[PDB]
Structures are given as structure tokens and as C-alpha cells.
Assembly symmetry: C4
Homo-oligomer: 44 residues x 4
């Protein structure tokens, strides 16, 4: 009951952490595209 | 009592995680503006 | 005893999350400097 | 039993947080390389 409510709360933390992970994967991908763009302008 | 204190601690973790999420959203937005700036200099 | 060990574990999660927060603040600051550098080359 | 299952869940959260930390270290490193590239084009 109190244990169950705490388990649910930790599951919410876990879910919100995955949303943050997915955001950070988007950050990595977008910065890589920007980096490759700059490199394409210099090397080609 | 011990359960209540642990619940409060997990709520603090959850709050701090949202502060981190909001920071990472700012990172994404700022890098997108920088990326679009570079693209504006090349495509226009 | 089991409760105490779980509290310690959650405190470790909280600490590691702050280390991650401090890293993400460094990411924001460094990207801002890079963005401002590019802008300095164009606007001045 | 319920305590054990909760401990396992928190350990999963901790592991997933380290995966996120490692991703964010890669973000920092890649952006630093991009920043240094731009600086190399201007200062040399
Ligand atoms: Na977290």
C-alpha cells in the first residue's frame, strides 16, 4: 500500500529518465549533423 | 516514518531529474539555433 | 536494515544524477561559447 | 520480496542513469571536437 505507492513513484522516475535519454539521443544526433555540415563545407 | 522519509527522498530525485530535463531541452533548443544560423549563412 | 540499504542506494542515484547535471551544465556553457564565437565572426 | 523487487527496480534506474551519463560524456566530447575544428579554421 505505502510500498506499492513507492514502487509506482520509482516507475515514474524510470519512465521520465527514458524520456530524458531519448531527448539526449536527439541532442547527439543533431549536433553530429551540424558537425558533419561544417566538415562538408571544408573538406569538399 | 522510515518509508515516508524514503518517499520524500525519491520525490527529490524526481524533481531534480525534471530540472535536468528542462536544462537538456535548453541545450537542444540552443544547438538548433546555432545549427540554423550556420545553415542560413550557407543556403541564403 | 533492508530499508537502510535501499535509502543508501537511492542517495547514490541522487548523487550520480547531480554529477550528470553538472556535466550537462558544462555542455550548455561550452555550446554557448561555440555559438557566440560563430556569431562574433559574422556580426563583428 | 516486495522490498527486494523495489531494490532491483532502483538498481535498474541507476544502471540506466549511467548509460545516460556515458551518452552525455559523448555529447560533450563531440561538441568539443566541433568547437576546436571551428577554432582551428580561424586561429591557424
Ligand atoms: Na535520473
Amino acid at each position: 500500500s505505502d510500498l506499492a505507492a513507492l514502487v509506482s513513484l520509482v516507475e515514474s522516475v524510470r519512465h521520465e529518465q527514458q524520456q530524458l535519454r531519448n531527448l539526449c539521443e536527439m541532442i547527439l544526433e543533431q549536433q553530429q549533423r551540424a558537425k558533419e555540415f561544417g566538415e562538408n563545407l571544408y573538406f569538399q
